[PDB]
Design a binder for this molecule. Structure first.
Ligand SMILES: N[C@@H](Cc1c[nH]c[nH+]1)C(=O)O
Ligand SMILES: N[C@@H](Cc1c[nH]c[nH+]1)C(=O)O
Ligand SMILES: CSc1ccc(N)cc1
Ligand SMILES: CSc1ccc(N)cc1
Lengths: 410, 410
């Protein structure tokens, strides 16, 4: 007997499970359309080089990589953003800006689950914080579309420029900034003795702790100035999100850095207000990535990723994922095999009119055909019997036996 | 500068291309719903064992496989059907039958393109040819939904039981039947001297050629009998497809075997009636696969695969793939940055009412905002200016400047 279980750390999606996933994706798609984002895709298999950033990131530590038979180093994408950048670079001057691109790629890791789907939304060619605002509102919009309120979740928001200044003022060559954000991001999970050790292990702390634990924007105006670009940006951000109507969804948190190397400005993180779950989504501005990839002109970018697992746990906890049973409008039941041809002509017309319809495919008695119709969640059973066919009719019966002329069925 | 090109033999899908792919997938999805099929998915990464059938298949010759870091032999699926079977086996008795499952997996190969998307439709637990009928009608339905007529394409249909008998009558142990179908399938591409050599290389021909070139069902009634199960099946098949209204789409071809090992009965192949393109889709009955995988009870199955490339070439040839430009209902234009907050409250309401809307994100003059709106295919531009806002109004303008009160916009 064969191995019925999927490969280590990956999920099967039989119809029941697939309905749950499709309910989630519908929202991701519907939200992108609402916000004017265009869909894209790229291979799940990308060159390994694409992710060699050399900043001790979890995402590049836990790459699911291998060597092709022909020698080339490739990998199953751990994230989409580098793929996006490559596409953007290839377009170059032909790419009209600003561009708003989205996708729902499966992304991978080797280690616990080894794959997840991650909704990606990104805005390209927008200098101002209006990008981050839109993005953050898109994420709130989706969560709200799934049944969640500002009582259930929020989005913590920060800027890396604050810390950039503190690092810069402290004489630290700017090349150390990315490795620092990555360690500081660990602060949540690892202890302060362990996190302090990594910053010292990178050749160096006090000012970092104090600034991470600042609880308000006023307090960072004290420390940095009321027109550090970061203060002006965050105020504009919050004012814009206020104005869009999602003020109760967003708040400031000076400890939020995110784990990725390329964020340069505003960064953000979705969370459940009960403190039970990991981050629901994560994102930020990344204005230098494309310059890093070799763009002859800097290209401002911002975006986020929004996983398919934490959100589902959350929705299951809040009882917002009722099992969605399969449905179909009509189930056509031939009285017996001599009626099959006629049953098919009826099936054809039901479908021609835009309805979803089955026909009983195997041979069985009418009552068992009816039970089957109930089991597949048919809204209506259409019995095709010889007596009624003579009258140009069939027997209809609503499941959620009046005879009906064929033309009136639809 | 980074490598902008995708990995060898795989496709990027920027927004333009993705619109074409989504137009195709919409049809695959819409057709499955019309026919009552339920969506499923499974990992693109499956155990390599799953595909070791030992019958010289192209699909298992050109497996994109590798060894995980932990030693396990895995591969990127070359086809979905084995995944489907595994899922079905795992369900066992809990799986209610008949089941009609579909998916649009990316599938892989190593060698020319190395990936394609393949719509899969399969019916489980149906003994009779009504399964093959439904499946064949689903494929015609999709092609017709894409603009194609029975003048443009057809479906060639055969049964492997015919050849099974000829092989059986000729004393050939039934274990040789699969290897034979695989060689005979090559007959299209390779010469008869080369195809004859493989059948002799498998320890053995004349009767095979003659029966492959039989041009009608009557002629196979002569050779096999008018109640070989295969004659009764094909007549039922054609009668049912006749009755559904797709008689002009289907025809008999005794040379059609298909390249896969597991087909046991009816097999079929979509084709363009101009003889320009490879097969558009392919499928058949496979009643023994699950018994092969270890099912304690035989499970009848039939299905097909329908690629994303040949169909697109065909549609491009018939001029049925006009470029689909991006669209969005509204583009909200703040007169200047002081109007941004108000512009956002308007944006919120447009979206709240189910419309797709952008807001101009960067700072620019109104005429350039208008050009942008035209470029993204906005149906309507909504200017948010201070003079009109005082009146509780905005300036609307249809692109495919009458002032309007906020409540009337939606
Ligand atoms: N790539 C980020 C999310 C993101 C998309 N765009 C910008 N950031 C992540 O995987 O968490
Ligand atoms: N797996 C077949 C198509 C198919 C699906 N179900 C049965 N046959 C192919 O790749 O051509
Ligand atoms: C849970 S599977 C997963 C895969 C890739 C990343 N970057 C994170 C998580
Ligand atoms: C054109 S890519 C492709 C991938 C897998 C199979 N079986 C066939 C084709």
């Amino acid at each position: 007997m064969v191995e019925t279980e999927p490969v280590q750390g990956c999920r099967d999606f039989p119809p029941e499970a697939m309905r749950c996933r499709r309910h989630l994706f519908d929202v991701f798609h519907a939200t992108a359309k609402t916000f004017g984002f265009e869909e894209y895709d790229a291979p799940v298999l990308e060159s390994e080089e694409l992710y060699i950033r050399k900043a001790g990131e979890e995402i590049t530590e836990q790459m699911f990589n291998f060597i092709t038979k022909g020698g080339h180093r490739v990998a199953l994408r751990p994230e989409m953003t580098p793929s996006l950048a490559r596409l953007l670079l290839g377009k170059g001057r032909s790419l009209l800006l600003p561009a708003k691109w989205y996708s729902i790629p499966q992304c991978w890791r080797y280690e616990r689950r080894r794959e997840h789907y991650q909704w990606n939304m990104d805005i390209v060619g927008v200098k101002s914080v209006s990008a981050e605002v839109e993005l953050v509102c898109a994420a709130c919009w989706a969560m709200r579309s799934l049944g969640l309120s500002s009582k259930d979740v929020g989005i913590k928001v920060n800027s890396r420029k604050v810390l950039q200044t503190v690092v810069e003022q402290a004489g630290v060559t700017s090349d150390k900034f990315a490795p620092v954000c990555v360690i500081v991001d660990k602060m949540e999970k690892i202890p302060r003795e362990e996190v302090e050790a990594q910053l010292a292990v990178l050749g160096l702390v006090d000012a970092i702790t104090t600034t991470l634990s600042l609880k308000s924007i006023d307090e960072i105006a004290q420390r940095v100035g009321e027109e550090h670009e970061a203060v002006k940006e965050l105020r504009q951000f919050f004012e814009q999100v206020e104005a869009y109507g999602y003020g109760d969804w967003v708040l400031f948190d000076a400890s939020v850095v995110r784990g990725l190397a390329y964020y340069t400005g505003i960064v953000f993180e979705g969370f459940d207000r009960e403190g039970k779950f990991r981050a629901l989504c994560g994102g930020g501005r990344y204005d230098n990535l494309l310059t890093t990839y070799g763009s002859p002109t800097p290209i401002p970018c911002a975006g986020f990723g929004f996983g398919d697992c934490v959100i589902v746990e959350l929705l299951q906890e809040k009882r917002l994922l009722p099992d969605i049973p399969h449905v179909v409008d009509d189930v056509v039941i031939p009285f017996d095999e001599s009626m099959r041809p006629h049953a098919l002509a009826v099936l054809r017309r039901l479908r021609d009119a835009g309805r979803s319809a089955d026909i009983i495919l195997d041979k069985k008695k009418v009552v068992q055909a009816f039970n089957y119709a109930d089991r597949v969640g048919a809204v209506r059973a259409v019995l095709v019997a010889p007596e009624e066919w003579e009258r140009g009719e069939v027997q209809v019966k609503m499941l959620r036996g009046f005879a009906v002329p064929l033309d009136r069925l639809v």
